[PDB]
Amino acid sequence: VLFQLYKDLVVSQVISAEEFWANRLATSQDIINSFQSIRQEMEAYTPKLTQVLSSSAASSTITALSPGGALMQGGTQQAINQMVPNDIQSELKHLYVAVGELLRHFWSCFPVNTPFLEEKVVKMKSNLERFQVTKLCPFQEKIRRQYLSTNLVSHIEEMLQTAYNKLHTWQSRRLMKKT
């Protein structure tokens, strides 16, 4: 796995060999008006029998509560244990491991307290972008070709977007501190 990870990051020009082992080692009085109105409305209140439920409402509720309904959804990842074959699942696991390691390096670099780390974080972001372009885009193309219904790439996209937003916010703070 480590050798496979090394090839996918160094041979594919995602990261340099030097950097690879370096890391390894409410409203106005209208509310009172509404309260008065509801108090007056409920002052003359009587129990009801027909209006409590209707045949249409009960049928709709049973349809919702029947299997395959909104609340009782029956699909819910039917055969993901066998969907998207394990050959792709192994590749997805490898991508998850690579993303986890790169983000671990990024979050270990954070917070940036010295000017040396500033270049290191930029290099880490460049490595993340190169890894994304190298692996995720062909992975997304393969998924679209196979038309997989699962949004496997979505979590990786969310993690990358969170890291990029954090870095952009930190850069914006750094620029404002120098103003």
Partner: protein, 434 residues
């Protein structure tokens, strides 16, 4: 027999007529199993039938047995009926009469179960709840004493005939009082609500001899079951047969009524408990009863030896001889254990086993002593020259169902005396045809 067993044996017309009264529907619904009640409540507001598969998918796979039992019981009680859904499907929908009356009982609608109580104003001779309970106890004790035959308790002739029809007491010779049978002892050993229910079921079965409507009697009984204790109800609005049934209930102690012409009647705790602790048991085979009436003392003495009789306490010892005598009288050990557990003192209820296991096990073992030897009269055949001849005769005996015991190793068989002639004729004919 419980209520559901009797209801399931009635014709569909009687069941349909019963559901026309809201009180009957509530009793039937409460008699249902736990799973059936949820299905009834879910389908209470449905105007369309549901697929059978959809209903079957509500319960998990492991509990499918309970689902099948509940569905079968509902079908037998005719609460819902099969509907031919278009497209070859089968739909289940509640009975419209039963559903309407159940909703009326729950939500509301129509007129009250009783006519009124304020028309005649307050009762001039109203009693209290403890007084009503004492009256019910006195009536039930009088009935059970009349079962024994003491001259102090004198009841109506028809009440005695009802016991005669129930088989508890048989009048072999006219003029002399009937003698209680073993079934009478077993009935006495039963608890009071079960005794009342058995008596009412016998009354329902034999009502056809008196020409009384079963549906009306059942509806009135169910209405009495849900009646509020200590509250009077209107006699008016009932048929003449219902008046006679109410008088019989008053004789039974279920209903209190000052006069036959009175327009008020007070349901008692027996009537409320009709639809549905003073004995201390010790590990040293001793019984302590906090009772004073002769009835409980006699019932406990039926299967135990009395030692002391305090004004408010009875000290008794359960011995082997007393239990054996009670079993010889016809009372089984299970009935004794049930009676002890039902009458158990509230203190004994604290232990997870209400009755200590040693006493119950000892009583059960004492019951098994009597039936150690099993007796079956019969005729023994041991003159079989060949195994093949024995096999044919044994097969013929098993076909006739007159076999008692078989021994293939020693070619020995035992047959009932009634089938002995048939077996002899079959054996003789085989030799003649040879």
């Amino acid at each position: 027999r419980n209520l559901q067993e009797f209801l399931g044996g009635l014709s569909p017309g009687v069941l349909d007529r019963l559901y026309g009264h809201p009180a009957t529907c509530l009793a039937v619904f409460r008699e249902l199993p736990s799973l059936a009640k949820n299905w009834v409540m879910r389908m209470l507001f449905l105007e369309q039938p549901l697929p059978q598969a959809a209903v079957a998918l509500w319960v998990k796979k492991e509990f499918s047995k309970a689902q099948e039992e509940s569905t079968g019981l509902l079908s037998g009680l005719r609460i819902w009926h099969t509907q031919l859904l278009p497209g070859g499907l089968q739909g289940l929908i509640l009975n419209p009469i039963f559903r309407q009356n159940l909703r009326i009982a729950l939500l509301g609608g129509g007129k009250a179960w009783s006519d009124d109580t304020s028309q005649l104003g307050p009762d001039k001779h109203a009693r209290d709840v403890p007084s009503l309970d004492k009256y019910a106890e006195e009536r039930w004790e009088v009935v059970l004493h009349f079962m024994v035959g003491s001259p102090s308790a004198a009841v109506s002739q028809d009440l005695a005939q009802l016991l005669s029809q129930a088989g508890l007491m048989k009048s072999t010779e006219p003029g002399e009082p009937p003698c209680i049978t073993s079934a009478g002892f077993q009935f006495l050993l039963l608890d009071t609500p079960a005794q009342l229910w058995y008596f009412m079921l016998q009354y329902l079965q034999t009502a056809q001899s008196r020409g009384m409507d079963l549906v009306e009697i059942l509806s009135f009984l169910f209405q009495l079951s849900f009646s509020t204790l200590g509250k009077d109800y209107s006699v008016e609005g009932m048929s003449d047969s219902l008046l006679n049934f109410l008088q019989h209930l008053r004789e039974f102690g279920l209903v209190f009524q000052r006069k036959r012409k009175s327009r008020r009647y007070y349901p008692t705790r027996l009537a409320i408990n009709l639809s549905s602790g003073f004995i201390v048991v010790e590990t040293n085979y001793r019984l302590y009863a906090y009772t004073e009436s002769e009835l409980q003392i006699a019932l406990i003495a039926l299967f135990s030896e009395m030692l002391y009789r305090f004004p408010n306490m009875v000290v008794a010892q359960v011995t082997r001889e007393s239990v054996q005598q009670a079993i010889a009288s016809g009372i089984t050990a299970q009935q004794i254990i049930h009676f002890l557990r039902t009458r158990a003192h509230p203190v004994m209820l604290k232990q997870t086993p209400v009755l200590p296991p040693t006493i119950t096990d000892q009583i059960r073992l004492w019951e098994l002593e009597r039936d150690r030897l099993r007796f079956t009269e019969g005729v023994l055949y041991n003159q079989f020259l060949s195994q093949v001849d024995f096999e044919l005769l044994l097969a013929h005996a098993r076909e006739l169902g007159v076999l008692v015991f078989e021994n293939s190793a020693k070619r020995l068989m035992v047959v009932t005396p009634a089938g002995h002639s048939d077996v002899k004729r079959f054996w003789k004919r085989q030799k003649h045809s040879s």
